[model samples]
Target: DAFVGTWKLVSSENFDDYMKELGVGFATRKMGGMAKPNCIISVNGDVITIKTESTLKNTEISFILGQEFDEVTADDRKVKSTITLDGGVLVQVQKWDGKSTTIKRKREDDKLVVECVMKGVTCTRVYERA
Candidate 1:
C-alpha cells in the first residue's frame, strides 16, 4: 500500500483551530502545534497500525477496517474510532463526549495529505515519504 511507510510531516495548516474546536487545553494545543510528528503506518492481514512519533510524545493505534475500537488519543481523550477505506482514501471517525471528528488521509503525488475536521474547522497536514 502507498500509505504503508514512514511519513515525515512537511506542513500543517489550521491545526490550532481544529484542536480548539475539540476543546483541547491551551498548553496541549501549543505543544501539539509545535511538534512535527512522523507517521509510521503498517498493515498486517486485516489490521492497520499507525504510529505517531514526535519530540513531545508518541502514540500508536491499530485497528481492523470497518471495526470500531476504543482509542485513547494523544490529547488523552478516550474515544471510539472506526477506519474505512474509500477509493484509496483512509477515513477515520472518532466520537467522544457527544462530539465526533473526521480524519481523512490520502496520497497525492508522493505525499500523504491528512485532513482533520472537528465541528466545522478543518486542519490540513501534509507529509512526505521518508
Candidate 2:
C-alpha cells in the first residue's frame, strides 16, 4: 500500500486544542505538541498496524477495514475503534465508553497528514517520509 512506510513528524497545528478537549493535562499536552513523532504504517493484505513513536509517548494500533476492535489509544483511553479507507484517505472513529473521536489520514505530495477531531476540537498533524 502507498501508506505502508515510516513517516516522521514535521509539524502540527491546533493540537493543543485537540488534547485539551481530550482532557490531557497541560504539561503532558505541551510535551506532546513539542515532540517530533514518527509513524510506522504496515499493511499485510487486508490488515494494518500503525505505530506512533515519540519521546513523549508511543502507541500501536492494529485493525482491519470496517471491523470494530477494542483499542488502547496513545493517551491510554479504552475505546471501540473502526478504520476504513475512504477515497484515498484512511478514516478512523473511536468510541470510548462514553466519548468519541475521529481521525482522518491522507497523503499530500510527500507528506502524510492526519486530522484529529475530538469534542468539536480539531487538529492537523503532518509527517514526512522517514
Candidate 3:
C-alpha cells in the first residue's frame, strides 16, 4: 500500500501550540518539542496500525476502517476515535473530555503530510521515508 512504510520526522509547524491546547504539561511539552519521532505504518486489508517511537514515549495504535474504538492518547487521555480513508488521505477523529481532535494524513510522493487539530489549534507535521 502507498501508506505502508516507516517514516521519520522531518519538520513541524505549531506543534507546541497544539500540545498546549491539549492541556499538556510544560515539561512534557518540552520533551515533545525535542522528540524526533519515527512512525511505522502498516495495513492489513481494512485494518491499519500506527506505531510511533520517540525519546519521550512510544505508542502503537491499531484500528479498523469505519469502526470506533477506545483510544489512550499519547499524553494519556482516553478517547473514542475512528479512522477513515478517502482517496489518498487518511482521517482520524478522536473525541474526549467533551472535545475532539482530528488528524488528517496524506502521502505525497515520498513525504507524508500530517495535519492535527484540537481545541482550535492546528499543527502540520511532515515525515519522510525512513
Give the winner by TM-score: 1
The per-candidate count of clashes, in order, stands at 0, 0, 0
Model 3 misplaced stretches (Cα beyond 4 Å): none
Model 1 misses residue 116 by how many Å?
0.4
> Any residue pairs clashing in model 2, and if so which?
none
Higher-TM-score candidate of 1 and 2: 1
C-alpha lDDT of all candidate models, in order: 0.96, 0.90, 0.92
Off by over 4 Å in 1: none
From the highest TM-score down, the ranking of the candidates is 1, 3, 2
Across residues 1-130, which tens digit of lDDT does each residue of candidate 2 receive?
Answer: 7788999989899998999998888888878878898899998888899998998688998889999999987777788999999999999999976888999999988989999999778899999998
TM-score, one value per model? 0.98, 0.93, 0.95
Give the alpha carbon lDDT tens digit for every residue of 34-75 in model 1.
Answer: 899999999999989999999989999999999999999999
Candidate 1 local lDDT, residue 63: 96
What's the C-alpha lDDT at position 61 in model 1? Answer: 97
Ranking by lDDT: 1, 3, 2
- Structural RMSD, model 1: 0.6
